[PDB]
């Protein structure tokens, strides 16, 4: 379903994130804790602050399995497998929620990226964070 | 409801959008990135591709009527269901438009503030705009119930 | 027989019928595709959501289509309406005393 | 939501057959096995891990029968829904966290209890009056978020 | 995703319609156009009444797709292609209506079958409808 | 009266395709006069529609999203004659001929 093109606009989109992958990531998790309150919740031993050194720690983490998803982006349900028994069976993240949280990603790059976030671009990028929920959500 | 610093930190970046180009960038990514919402728009005539839907004129008339009505919104803060209440019965009774797709152009318009301000969008003048856009798509929604 | 009254607004008249939204399917798409309005041998300009208070301009929503009376004068106004792949609709109105009535629609 | 004059009399008949003390319990129950990320919601009501925990269990039970009060008290009061549900509203909405999509969630799961129980009787039209009741519960019980 | 004990509660669930899946998938498309009428618009070529020939028809076009997902539970994208193909770029179906359909085809299979509706085959019959109505959205 | 619309046909095992008769085509025209189908004749024999059932070997057809499948069961060698009627539409005429298993598309007629 990721077409050719969709795969040449993640891979140039998400490779301009680069060493800024962990800052983006923080960003979009800040982001995300600032617009929908409620997705705190399932971090209550965490420094939410701004600036916290948890959440830069959590936003590489993040960061980093996206970086691994289009890097598998042929065999993501593989890839990510590990990571859907987490959220699902240990976190029990509603599946709202990730939606919430791909949307502040996507803010993010919109933000960082004034020249590659084009339509196109965008419906590429959203496409491959709908594939990433979809796996991450996919051991109920 | 807005803080009176968030109401403040919306009015500041809305006074920077240029009103004859952003609702037609939002529209036309609405109609990229969910391409079922073209089923409401067959009469626009060509959106195949990124760009024919980026360079239609009826897309770029069809914004700024869009973002006038969320000029609308942002002056009647504490009474967007009066303020939408005829537009609400119109995409119900009329357009037959799912209440989700109100969710779904309040996003993309996020996007492209995102977009347009860069590091001015910060997550503090998003998660103000994230209340606004869901102030309008309820809104919206009212008079399907 | 499908256009047969009108409204007076400030500065402009109202055509109710001439509804982008109608039920009937051809109407729809004759509003829906309008491509030219002369009040008088004078173009008006669709001015998209504007008002058309005092201007040479019309805009059709969801109240129907809204023309401006700038270009109207004392005794009778003709208005074409051009649409694409539509036959053009001739509307024949009266100004008298500021008042505008409706005469005839014809196509 | 309003319901027409006969939408409110196939309700009315239909519930007043509903087992009070069991059908609340039957629709928390399916909810927390058919979605369970519900469960995180109710840590407190034990053992959970299987469909029979889930069904057997008292707190499910006892609560589900809160739950059930409360869509009856909403029948009852179908053109102030918001009103009735504004203290439960702002229970599930400040206190708890509960995204709204799960309030939909429930009053499905509650249709679909009813139509298990009542077969042929949970006719078309019948279901289609009780959606508009479980709608407009779910929009009244998510209002204090907007 | 589907896991063996679902696919063989779906199977054995799905086995006790049989010779009903037309009767079935035309009483869960009237459950869906009475309870949510705007479904009614990706029809208007249709005679919607109560026990229409046309209803009836496409009710056993709709069961006789699931009967074919059922025996291919295995490869389910590759078995629904064409008909996610069609839906997605010929019918432009948005893909909050499919979460409509499923909720009803479960309504009028609890209401059709009292003595196998356990709570483990409801959420067996629920994953496999979010399974179909995944791959029928998949094309966008 | 020639219809230059239906041009050409496919062969599956007991069957025959029209692809161009489209339930979902851009051709407004062409969907509405397939979706409005109420009878299909070949060599006199009325069809029933099965609706989604295989029409291998059937006197049956179905309009689905690959065109117009008729079974073979009435088809004999040499000139075949199919009939379609479709409510407010002029009736259209396919002649295909069949010659040692293979069936051939030789023209479609409607009035109008
Ligand atoms: C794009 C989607 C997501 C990705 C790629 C992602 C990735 C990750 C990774 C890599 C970890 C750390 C794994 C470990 O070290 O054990 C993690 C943990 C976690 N995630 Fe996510 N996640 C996503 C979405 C979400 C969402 C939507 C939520 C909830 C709002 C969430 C809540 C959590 C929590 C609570 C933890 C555990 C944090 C800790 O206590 O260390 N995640 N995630
Ligand atoms: C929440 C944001 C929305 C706002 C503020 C909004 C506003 C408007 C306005 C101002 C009009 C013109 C009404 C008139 O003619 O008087 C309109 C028309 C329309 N809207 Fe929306 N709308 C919204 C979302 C949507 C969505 C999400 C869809 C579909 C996916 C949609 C589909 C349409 C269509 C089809 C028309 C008619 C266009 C035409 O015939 O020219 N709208 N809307
Ligand atoms: C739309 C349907 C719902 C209705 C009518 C409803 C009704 C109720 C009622 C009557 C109470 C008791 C309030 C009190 O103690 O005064 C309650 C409590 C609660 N509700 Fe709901 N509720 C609904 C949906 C939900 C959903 C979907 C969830 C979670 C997934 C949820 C989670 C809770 C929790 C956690 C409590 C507190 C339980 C406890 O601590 O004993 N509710 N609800
Ligand atoms: C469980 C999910 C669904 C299944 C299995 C399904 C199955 C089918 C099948 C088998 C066809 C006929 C394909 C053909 O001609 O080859 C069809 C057609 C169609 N479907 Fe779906 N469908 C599903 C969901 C939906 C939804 C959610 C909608 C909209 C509310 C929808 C609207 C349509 C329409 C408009 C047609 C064409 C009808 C005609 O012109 O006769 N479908 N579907």
């Given at each position: ?22 800052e ?10 600032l617009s929908?309150?409620?997705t705190?919740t ?38 990510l ?20 949280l791909?949307?502040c ?16 671009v965008?419906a ?17 | 409801?807005l803080?009176?610093?968030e ?35 067959e009469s626009?005539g ?16 069809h ?9 609308d ?5 504490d ?7 005829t ?6 009774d ?7 797709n ?5 996003n993309?318009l996020?996007?492209?503030?995102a977009?347009?301000?860069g590091?001015?969008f910060?997550?503090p003048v998003?998660?103000?705009?994230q ?6 798509a ?8 | 027989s499908?256009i ?9 008249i109202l ?10 399917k051809?109407?729809?798409?004759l ?13 008006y300009?669709?001015?998209?959501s ?16 809204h ?11 003709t ?9 053009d ?14 005469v005839?629609?014809?196509?």
């Open positions: 379903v990721l077409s050719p093109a969709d795969k040449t606009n993640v891979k140039a989109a998400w490779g301009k994130v680069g060493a800024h992958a962990g983006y990531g923080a960003e979009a998790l800040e982001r995300m804790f929908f309150p409620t705190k399932y971090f209550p031993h965490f420094d939410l602050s701004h600036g916290s050194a948890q959440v830069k720690g959590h936003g590489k983490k993040v960061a980093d399995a996206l970086t691994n998803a289009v890097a598998h982006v042929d065999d993501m349900p593989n890839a497998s590990a990571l859907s028994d987490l959220h699902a069976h240990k976190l029990r993240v509603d599946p709202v929620n990730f939606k919430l791909s949307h990603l996507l803010v993010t790059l919109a933000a960082h990226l004034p020249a590659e976030f084009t339509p196109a965008h590429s990028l959203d496409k491959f964070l709908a594939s990433v929920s979809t796996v991450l959500t996919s051991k109920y | 409801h803080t009176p610093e109401k403040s930190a919306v009015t500041a970046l809305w006074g920077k959008v240029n009103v004859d180009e952003v609702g037609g960038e939002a529209l036309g990514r609405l109609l990229v990135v969910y391409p079922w919402t073209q089923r409401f728009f626009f060509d959106l195949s591709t990124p760009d024919a839907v980026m360079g239609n004129p009826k897309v770029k008339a914004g700024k009527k869009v973002l006038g009505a969320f000029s919104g942002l002056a009647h803060l009474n967007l269901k009066g303020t939408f209440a537009l609400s019965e119109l995409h119900c009329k357009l037959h438009v799912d209440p989700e109100f969710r779904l152009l309040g993309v996020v996007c492209v503030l977009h347009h301000f590091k001015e910060t997550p998003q998660a103000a705009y209340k606004v856009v869901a102030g309008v309820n809104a919206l929604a009212h008079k399907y119930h | 499908l047969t009254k009108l409204s007076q607004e400030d500065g402009a055509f109710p019928e001439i509804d982008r939204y109608s039920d009937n051809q109407i729809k798409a509003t829906q595709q309008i491509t030219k309005v002369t009040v008088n041998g004078t173009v300009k669709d001015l998209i504007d008002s058309v208070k005092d201007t040479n301009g019309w805009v059709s929503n969801m109240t129907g289509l023309l401006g009376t700038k270009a109207f004068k004392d005794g009778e106004n208005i074409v309406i051009s649409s694409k792949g539509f036959e609709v001739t509307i024949t109105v009266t100004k008298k005393d500021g008042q505008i009535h409706f005839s629609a014809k196509q």
